[PDB]
Design a protein around this ligand. Structure first.
Ligand SMILES: [Fe+3]
Ligand SMILES: [Fe+3]
Length: 287
């Protein structure tokens, strides 16, 4: 009944929700256990709703649940980037962790490049934690982030991750052998899964403007799907005007779930529903 009270307070509502340090610490400790007990490559089954980046936009997260259904009315896969930039990362991550604890088999969260301590320091989560609580709580979130799964396959056909593909990715077993907990390295497989972007104008692998990881073209996607017998790559990590955006003739979709991203864009947010026959549709949240 501790958990339902945390949930009730989170849903009660820029107006903050300040839970207690012990509650938040319990959310990190318990969710971290569940993450580590579940595989690092999730095997999920439709029907499911899939969401892109939130970046602390807590009112938009509650909006996504209004559109999609509060759990356990729908099953969820989130693709990362819960924290940083927005004004309410603490409420966002804590509702996500509360749902994962209460619904461990029907609510799933992947690791984004922002679920990384070094990126947090720079992009606001460290500061939000230090201000509202203390640096040690931030360390507790960090240790929890280091245990998140990295990718998911829905019904053997949809490959999901925050960023994209890697040139070092030859078999799915490489992903399964990634040890947790771990920080995200500056280069290599785990990095690439969290950081890579598709690019229309590149062929093969390219230099990525971010100064981290790579870009990959349409041909890389077609080869990856064919090789691994998949129909779709579902990823996030880039703001797209319509909330979702296809690439490589519908073989890759980018999802982004934070409308009016960071005050600075006029984008819709989208959420992708996958039904039991693997049909994909989109609910759109305009800014
Ligand atoms: Fe992001
Ligand atoms: Fe990202």
């Amino acid at each position: 009944l501790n958990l339902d009270s945390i949930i009730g307070r989170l849903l009660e509502v820029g107006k903050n929700v300040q839970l207690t340090e012990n509650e938040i610490r319990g959310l990190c400790l318990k969710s971290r256990e569940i993450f580590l007990s579940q595989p690092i490559l999730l095997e999920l089954e439709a029907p499911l709703k899939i969401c892109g980046d939130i970046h602390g936009q807590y009112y938009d997260l509650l909006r996504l649940f209004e559109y999609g259904g509060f759990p356990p009315e729908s099953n969820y896969l989130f693709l990362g980037d819960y924290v940083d930039r927005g004004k309410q990362s603490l409420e966002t991550i804590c509702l996500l962790l509360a749902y994962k604890i209460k619904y461990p088999e029907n609510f799933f969260l992947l690791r984004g490049n922002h679920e990384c301590a070094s990126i947090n320091r720079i992009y606001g989560f460290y500061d939000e934690c230090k201000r509202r609580y203390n640096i040690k709580l931030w360390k507790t979130f960090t240790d929890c982030f280091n245990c998140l799964p990295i990718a998911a396959i829905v019904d053997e056909k949809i490959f999901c991750c925050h960023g994209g593909l890697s040139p070092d990715l030859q078999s799915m077993e490489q992903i399964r052998r990634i040890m947790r907990p771990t920080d995200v390295p500056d280069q290599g497989l785990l990095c690439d899964l969290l950081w890579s972007d598709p690019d229309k104008d590149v062929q093969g692998w390219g230099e990525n403007d971010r100064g981290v990881s790579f870009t990959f073209g349409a041909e890389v996607v077609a080869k990856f799907l064919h090789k691994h017998d998949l129909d779709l790559i579902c990823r996030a990590h880039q703001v797209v005007e319509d909330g979702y955006e296809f690439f490589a003739k519908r073989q890759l979709v980018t999802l982004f779930s934070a409308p009016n991203y960071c005050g600075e864009f006029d984008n819709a947010g989208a959420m992708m529903s996958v039904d039991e026959t693997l049909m994909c549709s989109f609910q759109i949240l305009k800014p």
